[PDB]
Amino acid sequence: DMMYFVIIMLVVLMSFGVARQAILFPNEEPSWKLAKNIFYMPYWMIYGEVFADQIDPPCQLPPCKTGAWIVPAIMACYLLVANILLVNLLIAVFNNTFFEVKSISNQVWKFQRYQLIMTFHERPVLPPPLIIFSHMTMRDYGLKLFITDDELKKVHDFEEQCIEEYFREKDDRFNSSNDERIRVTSERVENMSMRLEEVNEREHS
Amino acid sequence: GLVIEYLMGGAYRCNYTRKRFRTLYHNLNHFPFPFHELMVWAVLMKRQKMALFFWQHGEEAMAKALVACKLCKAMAHEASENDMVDDISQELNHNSRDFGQLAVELLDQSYKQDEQLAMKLLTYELKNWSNATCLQLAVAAKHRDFIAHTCSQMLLTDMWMGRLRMRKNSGLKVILGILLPPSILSLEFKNGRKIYEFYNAPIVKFWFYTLAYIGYLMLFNYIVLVKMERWPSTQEWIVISYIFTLGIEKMREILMSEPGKLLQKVKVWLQEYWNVTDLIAILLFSVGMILRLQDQPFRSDGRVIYCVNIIYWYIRLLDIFGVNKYLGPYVMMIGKMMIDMMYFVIIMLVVLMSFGVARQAILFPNEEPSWKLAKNIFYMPYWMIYGEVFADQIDPPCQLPPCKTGAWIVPAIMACYLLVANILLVNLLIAVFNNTFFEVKSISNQVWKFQRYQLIMTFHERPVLPPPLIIFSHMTMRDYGLKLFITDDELKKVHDFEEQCIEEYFREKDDRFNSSNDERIRVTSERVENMSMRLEEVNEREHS
Numbered sequence: 001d002m003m004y005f006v007i008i009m010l011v012v013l014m015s016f017g018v019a020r021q022a023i024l025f026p027n028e029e030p031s032w033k034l035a036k037n038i039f040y041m042p043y044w045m046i047y048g049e050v051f052a053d054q055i056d057p058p059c060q061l062p063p064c065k066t067g068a069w070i071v072p073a074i075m076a077c078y079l080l081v082a083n084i085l086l087v088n089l090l091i092a093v094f095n096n097t098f099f100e101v102k103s104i105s106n107q108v109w110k111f112q113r114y115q116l117i118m119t120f121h122e123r124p125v126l127p128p129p130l131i132i133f134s135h136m137t138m139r140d141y142g143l144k145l146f147i148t149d150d151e152l153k154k155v156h157d158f159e160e161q162c163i164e165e166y167f168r169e170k171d172d173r174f175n176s177s178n179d180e181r182i183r184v185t186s187e188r189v190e191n192m193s194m195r196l197e198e199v200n201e202r203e204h205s
Numbered sequence: 206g207l208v209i210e211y212l213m214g215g216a217y218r219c220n221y222t223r224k225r226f227r228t229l230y231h232n233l234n235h236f237p238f239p240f241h242e243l244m245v246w247a248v249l250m251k252r253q254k255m256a257l258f259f260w261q262h263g264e265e266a267m268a269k270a271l272v273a274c275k276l277c278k279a280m281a282h283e284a285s286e287n288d289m290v291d292d293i294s295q296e297l298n299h300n301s302r303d304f305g306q307l308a309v310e311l312l313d314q315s316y317k318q319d320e321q322l323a324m325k326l327l328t329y330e331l332k333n334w335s336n337a338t339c340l341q342l343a344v345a346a347k348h349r350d351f352i353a354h355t356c357s358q359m360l361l362t363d364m365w366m367g368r369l370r371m372r373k374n375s376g377l378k379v380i381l382g383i384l385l386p387p388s389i390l391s392l393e394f395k396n397g398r399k400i401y402e403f404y405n406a407p408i409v410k411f412w413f414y415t416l417a418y419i420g421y422l423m424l425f426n427y428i429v430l431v432k433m434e435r436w437p438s439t440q441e442w443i444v445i446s447y448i449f450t451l452g453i454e455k456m457r458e459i460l461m462s463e464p465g466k467l468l469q470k471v472k473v474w475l476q477e478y479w480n481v482t483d484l485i486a487i488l489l490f491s492v493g494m495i496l497r498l499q500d501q502p503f504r505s506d507g508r509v510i511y512c513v514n515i516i517y518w519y520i521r522l523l524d525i526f527g528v529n530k531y532l533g534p535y536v537m538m539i540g541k542m543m544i545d546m547m548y549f550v551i552i553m554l555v556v557l558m559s560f561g562v563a564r565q566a567i568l569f570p571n572e573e574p575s576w577k578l579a580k581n582i583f584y585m586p587y588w589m590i591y592g593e594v595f596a597d598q599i600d601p602p603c604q605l606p607p608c609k610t611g612a613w614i615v616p617a618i619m620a621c622y623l624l625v626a627n628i629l630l631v632n633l634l635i636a637v638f639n640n641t642f643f644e645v646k647s648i649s650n651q652v653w654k655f656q657r658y659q660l661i662m663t664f665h666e667r668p669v670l671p672p673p674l675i676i677f678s679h680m681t682m683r684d685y686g687l688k689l690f691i692t693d694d695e696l697k698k699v700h701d702f703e704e705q706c707i708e709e710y711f712r713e714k715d716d717r718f719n720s721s722n723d724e725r726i727r728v729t730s731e732r733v734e735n736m737s738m739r740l741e742e743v744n745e746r747e748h749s
């Protein structure tokens with residue numbers, strides 16, 4: 001998300017820098033320093049380094065360059081666009097996407113604990129600086145668990161009881177829901193109404 | 206027929222005003238699709254129940270729904286513009302929204318049931334509805350929920366890709382093919398001639414246009430960053446040629462607009478802000494260029510005009526960025542937040558001007574009338590709030606010159622000004638941006654999805670060459686991408702598919718309604734009341 005805003009900021013910064021350099025220095029031979037003056041000072045400005053005497057020098061003083069009065073105006077517009085609009089929009093973007101990112105990050109970290117534990121289980125005792133010797137020299141628990149027949153049967157019985165309880169609890173929750181009770185009541189009321197109509201249909205008197 | 210043509214829009218034509226129907230009419234039968242006529246009549250007479258009954262009988266349900274939506278919208282606008290009772294307008298708007306919702310639900314059902322036939326249903330030509338398509342009718346009615354649907358978006362993507370089967374990684378391969386013409390033959394094509402089908406896809410035209418614009422911007426930067434001679438250089442000539450070719454292309458795309466009046470097309474074109482800004486920029490560049498070929502002061506003024514003009518061409522890259530799935534909505538959000546920023550700029554200006562006037566008046570009490578006074582009010586107080594705070598200049602000490610009367614108040618008002626500006630208003634603006642982000646983001650996404658269609662159409666209707674090279678193409682002067690021509694048997698297949706879809710939609714809606722809790726409770730209560738009355742009557746009798 002930060003990179004998606006860096007591009008727009010770069011566009012605005014380059015526009016301002018090219019305009020300022022072109023206006024203030026109208027007699028320049030082609031040189032690689034021109035590519036540097038576009039980005040350097042306009043980038044430092046938005047981080048608090050604002051110097052009005054350098055962005056627009058006064059003009060005893062050397063003669064005024066044509067159109068030298070436009071530099072402060074475009075500078076004001078550039079500062080307003082950069083430090084107020086885009087920064088606050090990026091703050092809003094970070095603020096409004098925080099919850100889902102945080103939850104996903106928590107889940108991913110909890111998942112990735114396993115590989116860390118396995119990696120440090122499968123590693124030598126000595127740390128890297130002195131594992132050299134180990135290189136030349138070259139699961140009861142931490143990975144598995146070997147169980148006996150009686151304990152295996154105990155685990156099987158426990159699992160069967162758990163699955164039976166799960167299904168029974170699910171059925172009990174379903175049968176006592178409001179929707180199911182309403183549906184069953186409506187069906188029974190309809191059948192009872194038909195039965196009572198048939199009973200009243202007869203005329204034994 | 207004349208009223209239908211008036212309400213539908215510009216290029217629409219009704220069957221009543223065509224030669225065949227006039228010849229039948231003026232020498233006196235039958236209607237192959239009577240429910241079309243019946244539904245149009247019901248909509249024109251503002252009979253919503255009759256129109257809804259007529260909609261679900263016959264063929265072409267989605268086309269009829271879109272046409273009804275457009276007609277109701279136009280009728281509501283006409284009633285609102287003639288100063289009527291203004292409740293007819295809201296009734297007609299409700300009718301239009303109902304028909305639009307019906308169209309969206311039918312499209313959703315069709316896409317869920319079968320995607321390929323759903324896409325075929327949105328593109329086949331409608332002989333009964335002025336040779337239009339469902340997509341065109343949805344765009345003409347400005348139905349955003351219809352265009353922003355998944356099926357419409359995938360259809361737009363397929364039309365954007367042209368006759369190219371690649372979907373996993375585009376852009377890079379398109380650029381490689383443009384840069385390496387021999388590399389074109391390594392790409393897969395839908396069902397020599399690969400060059401023609403490559404250089405005519407809309408995406409290839411877009412990338413060619415983008416590369417040409419990037420090169421033009423590079424040359425403009427070069428010419429402004431180096432020293433000018435008496436006469437323009439080669440790069441300057443290329444820049445001028447690009448500007449001129451773009452200008453004539455914009456001029457000629459106005460003469461291909463739908464309205465037949467020269468003065469009507471101009472005001473229709475002048476409704477996108479980018480077009481107005483492009484026109485203003487071209488006029489300014491022309492002024493600067495004609496002022497550049499003169500003596501040194503005029504040449505300097507023209508060069509300054511060039512320097513100011515390059516900023517717009519830099520900013521215009523956001524329009525190109527708007528094609529990206531993520532950058533376009535962000536640009537729309539920026540445009541929408543500018544208004545909230547402007548509503549706070551005014552208050553900030555009021556506070557800033559108060560502080561600046563106070564400081565200037567106190568510190569300099571012997572000033573002659575001059576224009577520099579208007580500059581000292583705004584300059585330094587504005588620079589201060591961006592980190593440029595200098596206590597030795599806001600309140601100079603006073604070997605030292607004698608102290609001005611009341612010079613001690615400047616730091617106090619400065620402290621109050623900084624506290625008000627950098628703490629209160631900035632944080633309030635942050636809260637305003639934070640608390641309006643969700644709706645702005647959703648609206649921007651919907652608008653970008655809707656506006657993809659016009660981009661695809663624009664790059665379908667454009668020449669192969671980019672502006673700097675279309676200089677020749679100006680002198681030289683839809684099987685797909687717009688429509689889809691279908692055969693009789695496939696037309697019958699599409700009709701049967703649509704009828705099955707609408708039947709399934711109604712059946713599913715009825716099943717959902719009958720099994721709701723509220724309906725079951727209501728029916729149970731009524732049956733219980735009737736059963737209680739019947740049992741009371743049964744117990745009333747005394748046969749013992």
Ligand SMILES: COCC(CCO[C@H]1CC[C@@]2(C)C(=CC[C@H]3[C@@H]4C[C@@H]5O[C@]6(CC[C@@H](C)CO6)[C@@H](C)[C@@H]5[C@@]4(C)CC[C@@H]32)C1)COC
Nearest residue numbers: 014029030031032033034035038419422423424426427430
């Ligand atoms: C000291 O002596 C140096 C000399 C070499 C002088 O060559 C110069 C010719 C113009 C050139 C190539 C140079 C500096 C600015 C350069 C611009 C920076 C621009 O930035 C970019 C910025 C981002 C782009 C979007 C726009 O353009 C360039 C297209 C632009 C750019 C690279 C155009 C090229 C310019 C070097 C020695 O020769 C042997």
Ligand SMILES: COCC(CCO[C@H]1CC[C@@]2(C)C(=CC[C@H]3[C@@H]4C[C@@H]5O[C@]6(CC[C@@H](C)CO6)[C@@H](C)[C@@H]5[C@@]4(C)CC[C@@H]32)C1)COC
Nearest residue numbers: 554555558559562573574575576577578579580581582583
């Ligand atoms: C070097 O020689 C220059 C001289 C011209 C002298 O005329 C001066 C007369 C006062 C005048 C017109 C001038 C500068 C400050 C000007 C103020 C700035 C104020 O700002 C505004 C700011 C915003 C408003 C809300 C408040 O007032 C003005 C009403 C105010 C304002 C425009 C009043 C007018 C002032 C020019 C030559 O004469 C031929």
Ligand code: NA
Nearest residue numbers: 047048591592
């Ligand atoms: Na700061």
Ligand code: NA
Nearest residue numbers: 048049592593
């Ligand atoms: Na600072």
